Symmetry: C3
Protein backbone atom coordinates (compact mmCIF):
# COMPACT_ATOMS: atom_id res chain seq x y z
CA UNK A 1 0.00 0.00 0.00
CA UNK A 2 2.75 2.45 0.93
CA UNK A 3 4.13 1.38 -2.50
CA UNK A 4 0.69 1.96 -4.16
CA UNK A 5 0.78 5.44 -2.81
CA UNK A 6 4.37 6.18 -3.91
CA UNK A 7 3.47 5.00 -7.40
CA UNK A 8 0.21 7.05 -7.35
CA UNK A 9 2.10 10.18 -6.34
CA UNK A 10 4.59 9.63 -9.20
CA UNK A 11 1.90 9.20 -11.78
CA UNK A 12 0.42 12.46 -10.45
CA UNK A 13 3.64 14.49 -10.72
CA UNK A 14 4.26 13.25 -14.22
CA UNK A 15 0.73 14.30 -15.16
CA UNK A 16 0.91 17.87 -13.76
CA UNK A 17 4.04 18.34 -15.88
CA UNK A 18 2.06 17.17 -18.86
CA UNK A 19 -0.64 19.70 -18.10
CA UNK A 20 2.17 22.30 -17.82
CA UNK A 21 3.12 21.62 -21.45
CA UNK A 22 -0.50 21.70 -22.62
CA UNK A 23 -1.08 25.20 -21.23
CA UNK A 24 1.49 26.50 -23.75
CA UNK A 25 -1.24 26.01 -26.38
CA UNK A 26 -3.64 28.54 -24.79
CA UNK A 27 -1.02 31.21 -25.73
CA UNK A 28 -0.63 29.85 -29.21
CA UNK A 29 -4.26 29.20 -30.26
CA UNK A 30 -4.83 32.81 -29.20
CA UNK A 31 -2.28 34.37 -31.57
CA UNK A 32 -3.47 32.05 -34.38
CA UNK A 33 -7.00 33.34 -34.04
CA UNK A 34 -5.68 36.98 -34.11
CA UNK A 35 -3.92 36.17 -37.36
CA UNK A 36 -6.82 34.45 -39.05
CA UNK A 37 -8.69 37.72 -38.51
CA UNK A 38 -5.79 39.80 -39.86
CA UNK A 39 -5.45 37.51 -42.92
CA UNK A 40 -9.21 37.89 -43.35
CA UNK A 41 -9.09 41.70 -43.32
CA UNK A 42 -6.31 41.61 -45.99
CA UNK A 43 -8.29 39.29 -48.20
CA UNK A 44 -11.35 41.61 -48.13
CA UNK A 45 -9.10 44.59 -48.87
CA UNK A 46 -7.71 42.64 -51.93
CA UNK A 47 -11.22 41.59 -53.05
CA UNK A 48 -12.33 45.25 -53.33
CA UNK A 49 -9.26 46.33 -55.26
CA UNK A 50 -9.61 43.58 -57.76
CA UNK A 51 -13.22 44.99 -58.00
CA UNK A 52 -11.96 48.51 -58.70
CA UNK A 53 -9.40 47.22 -61.18
CA UNK A 54 -11.95 45.00 -62.86
CA UNK A 55 -14.33 47.92 -63.24
CA UNK A 56 -11.68 50.08 -64.88
CA UNK A 57 -10.36 47.45 -67.30
CA UNK A 58 -13.90 46.89 -68.57
CA UNK A 59 -14.51 50.60 -68.85
CA UNK A 60 -11.22 51.52 -70.42
CA UNK A 61 -11.77 48.75 -72.96
CA UNK A 62 -15.34 49.80 -73.81
CA UNK A 63 -14.59 53.45 -74.28
CA UNK A 64 -11.53 52.82 -76.47
CA UNK A 65 -13.64 50.41 -78.51
CA UNK A 66 -16.35 52.80 -79.42
CA UNK A 67 -14.07 55.81 -79.91
CA UNK A 68 -11.83 54.15 -82.42
CA UNK A 69 -14.77 52.63 -84.25
CA UNK A 70 -15.49 56.37 -84.86
CA UNK A 71 -11.98 57.47 -85.84
CA UNK A 72 -11.71 54.61 -88.38
CA UNK A 73 -14.73 56.18 -90.00
CA UNK A 74 -13.49 59.69 -90.19
CA UNK A 75 -10.54 58.17 -91.88
CA UNK A 76 -12.97 56.17 -94.02
CA UNK A 77 -14.89 59.30 -95.11
CA UNK A 78 -11.65 61.18 -95.39
CA UNK A 79 -9.94 58.76 -97.77
CA UNK A 80 -12.99 58.72 -100.02
CA UNK A 81 -13.14 62.50 -100.42
CA UNK A 82 -9.43 62.57 -101.12
CA UNK A 83 -9.77 60.10 -104.01
CA UNK A 84 -12.69 62.12 -105.28
CA UNK A 85 -10.75 65.40 -105.05
CA UNK A 86 -7.92 63.84 -107.00
CA UNK A 87 -10.48 62.95 -109.67
CA UNK A 88 -11.55 66.50 -109.85
CA UNK A 89 -8.08 67.89 -110.14
CA UNK A 90 -7.24 65.45 -113.00
CA UNK A 91 -10.36 66.69 -114.89
CA UNK A 92 -9.69 70.45 -114.19
CA UNK A 93 -6.14 70.10 -115.51
CA UNK A 94 -7.49 68.33 -118.58
CA UNK A 95 -9.89 71.22 -119.28
CA UNK A 96 -7.22 73.95 -119.02
CA UNK A 97 -5.08 72.19 -121.75
Amino acid sequence: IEDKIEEILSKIYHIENEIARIKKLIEKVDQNTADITTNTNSINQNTTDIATNTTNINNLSDSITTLMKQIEDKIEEILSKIYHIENEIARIKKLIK
Copy 2:
Protein backbone atom coordinates in the same frame (compact mmCIF):
# COMPACT_ATOMS: atom_id res chain seq x y z
CA ILE B 1 -9.29 3.27 2.50
CA GLU B 2 -8.70 0.35 0.15
CA ASP B 3 -11.85 1.77 -1.52
CA LYS B 4 -10.43 5.26 -1.40
CA ILE B 5 -7.40 3.95 -3.31
CA GLU B 6 -9.36 1.99 -5.95
CA GLU B 7 -11.39 5.12 -6.63
CA ILE B 8 -8.24 7.23 -6.86
CA LEU B 9 -6.69 4.76 -9.32
CA SER B 10 -9.77 4.96 -11.50
CA LYS B 11 -9.87 8.75 -11.54
CA ILE B 12 -6.23 8.55 -12.60
CA TYR B 13 -6.77 6.14 -15.49
CA HIS B 14 -9.65 8.21 -16.77
CA ILE B 15 -7.44 11.21 -16.64
CA GLU B 16 -4.47 9.82 -18.52
CA ASN B 17 -6.96 8.96 -21.27
CA GLU B 18 -8.29 12.53 -21.33
CA ILE B 19 -4.73 13.73 -21.67
CA ALA B 20 -4.11 11.30 -24.56
CA ARG B 21 -6.78 13.12 -26.58
CA ILE B 22 -5.51 16.56 -25.65
CA LYS B 23 -1.92 15.65 -26.70
CA LYS B 24 -3.49 15.48 -30.20
CA LEU B 25 -3.82 19.30 -30.43
CA ILE B 26 -0.03 19.87 -30.21
CA GLU B 27 -0.01 18.65 -33.84
CA LYS B 28 -3.14 20.62 -34.95
CA VAL B 29 -2.08 23.91 -33.50
CA ASP B 30 1.35 23.45 -35.22
CA GLN B 31 -0.23 22.60 -38.64
CA ASN B 32 -2.52 25.57 -38.31
CA THR B 33 0.27 28.06 -37.59
CA ALA B 34 2.29 26.76 -40.59
CA ASP B 35 -0.81 27.39 -42.72
CA ILE B 36 -1.54 30.87 -41.44
CA THR B 37 2.02 31.72 -42.58
CA THR B 38 1.45 30.07 -46.02
CA ASN B 39 -1.92 31.84 -46.47
CA THR B 40 -0.09 35.06 -45.45
CA ASN B 41 2.63 34.57 -48.08
CA SER B 42 -0.09 34.10 -50.74
CA ILE B 43 -1.93 37.22 -49.69
CA ASN B 44 1.16 39.45 -49.96
CA GLN B 45 1.81 38.11 -53.35
CA ASN B 46 -1.76 38.80 -54.64
CA THR B 47 -1.31 42.22 -52.97
CA THR B 48 1.67 43.04 -55.20
CA ASP B 49 -0.06 41.89 -58.38
CA ILE B 50 -3.12 43.94 -57.70
CA ALA B 51 -0.50 46.76 -57.32
CA THR B 52 1.07 45.99 -60.71
CA ASN B 53 -2.35 45.76 -62.35
CA THR B 54 -3.57 48.95 -60.68
CA THR B 55 -0.43 50.76 -61.92
CA ASN B 56 -1.05 49.71 -65.48
CA ILE B 57 -4.80 50.50 -65.56
CA ASN B 58 -3.58 54.03 -64.47
CA ASN B 59 -0.71 54.20 -67.08
CA LEU B 60 -2.57 52.51 -69.91
CA SER B 61 -5.50 54.90 -69.29
CA ASP B 62 -3.25 57.97 -69.27
CA SER B 63 -1.44 57.12 -72.46
CA ILE B 64 -4.62 56.27 -74.34
CA THR B 65 -6.14 59.50 -73.13
CA THR B 66 -3.48 61.76 -74.47
CA LEU B 67 -2.93 59.87 -77.74
CA MET B 68 -6.51 59.97 -78.86
CA LYS B 69 -6.89 63.61 -77.84
CA GLN B 70 -4.03 64.34 -80.26
CA ILE B 71 -5.51 62.13 -82.99
CA GLU B 72 -9.05 63.49 -82.89
CA ASP B 73 -7.26 66.84 -83.31
CA LYS B 74 -5.12 65.82 -86.31
CA ILE B 75 -8.41 64.58 -87.83
CA GLU B 76 -10.14 67.85 -86.85
CA GLU B 77 -7.55 69.99 -88.75
CA ILE B 78 -7.24 67.47 -91.59
CA LEU B 79 -11.01 67.58 -92.03
CA SER B 80 -10.96 71.36 -91.93
CA LYS B 81 -8.43 71.66 -94.75
CA ILE B 82 -10.34 69.14 -96.83
CA TYR B 83 -13.60 71.02 -96.60
CA HIS B 84 -11.68 74.16 -97.54
CA ILE B 85 -10.09 72.41 -100.52
CA GLU B 86 -13.53 71.36 -101.61
CA ASN B 87 -14.42 75.06 -101.56
CA GLU B 88 -11.42 75.97 -103.82
CA ILE B 89 -12.28 73.30 -106.32
CA ALA B 90 -15.91 74.45 -106.60
CA ARG B 91 -14.77 78.04 -107.22
CA ILE B 92 -12.06 77.02 -109.76
CA LYS B 93 -14.55 75.00 -111.75
CA LYS B 94 -16.90 77.95 -111.63
CA LEU B 95 -14.28 80.22 -113.13
CA ILE B 96 -13.34 77.87 -116.00
CA LYS B 97 -17.03 77.86 -117.19
Copy 3:
Protein backbone atom coordinates in the same frame (compact mmCIF):
# COMPACT_ATOMS: atom_id res chain seq x y z
CA ILE C 1 -1.07 8.36 5.08
CA GLU C 2 -4.67 9.52 5.57
CA ASP C 3 -3.04 12.95 5.00
CA LYS C 4 -1.17 11.64 1.94
CA ILE C 5 -4.53 10.55 0.51
CA GLU C 6 -6.41 13.81 1.26
CA GLU C 7 -3.52 15.67 -0.47
CA ILE C 8 -3.60 13.27 -3.45
CA LEU C 9 -7.37 13.75 -3.84
CA SER C 10 -6.86 17.51 -3.84
CA LYS C 11 -4.21 17.40 -6.47
CA ILE C 12 -6.65 15.33 -8.51
CA TYR C 13 -9.61 17.69 -8.28
CA HIS C 14 -7.44 20.64 -9.20
CA ILE C 15 -6.20 18.71 -12.21
CA GLU C 16 -9.61 17.72 -13.56
CA ASN C 17 -10.47 21.44 -13.42
CA GLU C 18 -7.38 22.10 -15.50
CA ILE C 19 -8.66 19.58 -18.00
CA ALA C 20 -12.10 21.24 -17.96
CA ARG C 21 -10.43 24.47 -18.85
CA ILE C 22 -8.25 22.93 -21.54
CA LYS C 23 -11.06 21.12 -23.39
CA LYS C 24 -12.11 24.80 -24.01
CA LEU C 25 -9.52 24.98 -26.78
CA ILE C 26 -10.89 22.09 -28.94
CA GLU C 27 -13.78 24.17 -30.29
CA LYS C 28 -11.38 27.10 -30.71
CA VAL C 29 -8.75 24.99 -32.62
CA ASP C 30 -11.35 23.63 -34.94
CA GLN C 31 -13.12 26.93 -35.61
CA ASN C 32 -9.66 28.15 -36.59
CA THR C 33 -9.04 25.25 -38.92
CA ALA C 34 -12.41 25.91 -40.62
CA ASP C 35 -11.28 29.48 -41.13
CA ILE C 36 -7.88 28.71 -42.52
CA THR C 37 -9.63 26.70 -45.23
CA THR C 38 -12.11 29.55 -45.89
CA ASN C 39 -9.36 32.16 -46.10
CA THR C 40 -7.57 29.70 -48.42
CA ASN C 41 -10.55 29.40 -50.72
CA SER C 42 -10.81 33.23 -50.97
CA ILE C 43 -7.16 33.55 -51.75
CA ASN C 44 -7.43 31.10 -54.67
CA GLN C 45 -10.36 33.09 -56.08
CA ASN C 46 -8.61 36.43 -55.80
CA THR C 47 -5.57 34.78 -57.42
CA THR C 48 -7.58 33.80 -60.50
CA ASP C 49 -9.24 37.18 -60.88
CA ILE C 50 -5.93 38.98 -60.74
CA ALA C 51 -5.04 36.45 -63.53
CA THR C 52 -8.06 37.44 -65.61
CA ASN C 53 -7.36 41.11 -65.01
CA THR C 54 -3.69 40.68 -65.82
CA THR C 55 -4.51 38.88 -69.05
CA ASN C 56 -6.76 41.73 -70.14
CA ILE C 57 -4.47 44.60 -69.29
CA ASN C 58 -1.79 42.97 -71.43
CA ASN C 59 -4.41 42.44 -74.12
CA LEU C 60 -5.89 45.94 -74.04
CA SER C 61 -2.36 47.34 -74.22
CA ASP C 62 -1.27 45.11 -77.10
CA SER C 63 -4.27 45.81 -79.26
CA ILE C 64 -4.07 49.59 -78.76
CA THR C 65 -0.39 49.46 -79.54
CA THR C 66 -0.69 47.90 -82.89
CA LEU C 67 -3.86 49.73 -83.94
CA MET C 68 -2.41 53.17 -83.43
CA LYS C 69 0.83 52.18 -85.07
CA GLN C 70 -1.40 51.32 -88.11
CA ILE C 71 -3.56 54.50 -87.94
CA GLU C 72 -0.56 56.75 -87.47
CA ASP C 73 0.58 55.00 -90.67
CA LYS C 74 -2.52 55.82 -92.69
CA ILE C 75 -2.32 59.42 -91.46
CA GLU C 76 1.37 59.45 -92.46
CA GLU C 77 0.22 58.75 -96.04
CA ILE C 78 -2.96 60.86 -95.99
CA LEU C 79 -0.88 63.89 -95.00
CA SER C 80 1.37 63.37 -98.00
CA LYS C 81 -1.59 63.18 -100.43
CA ILE C 82 -2.85 66.44 -98.93
CA TYR C 83 0.41 68.38 -99.31
CA HIS C 84 0.54 67.24 -102.88
CA ILE C 85 -3.05 68.33 -103.54
CA GLU C 86 -2.24 71.85 -102.22
CA ASN C 87 0.64 71.87 -104.74
CA GLU C 88 -1.60 71.33 -107.64
CA ILE C 89 -4.26 73.72 -106.46
CA ALA C 90 -1.57 76.41 -106.28
CA ARG C 91 -0.41 75.55 -109.84
CA ILE C 92 -4.00 75.38 -111.21
CA LYS C 93 -4.78 78.82 -109.83
CA LYS C 94 -1.56 80.22 -111.37
CA LEU C 95 -2.55 78.88 -114.78
CA ILE C 96 -6.05 80.46 -114.68
CA LYS C 97 -4.49 83.92 -114.06
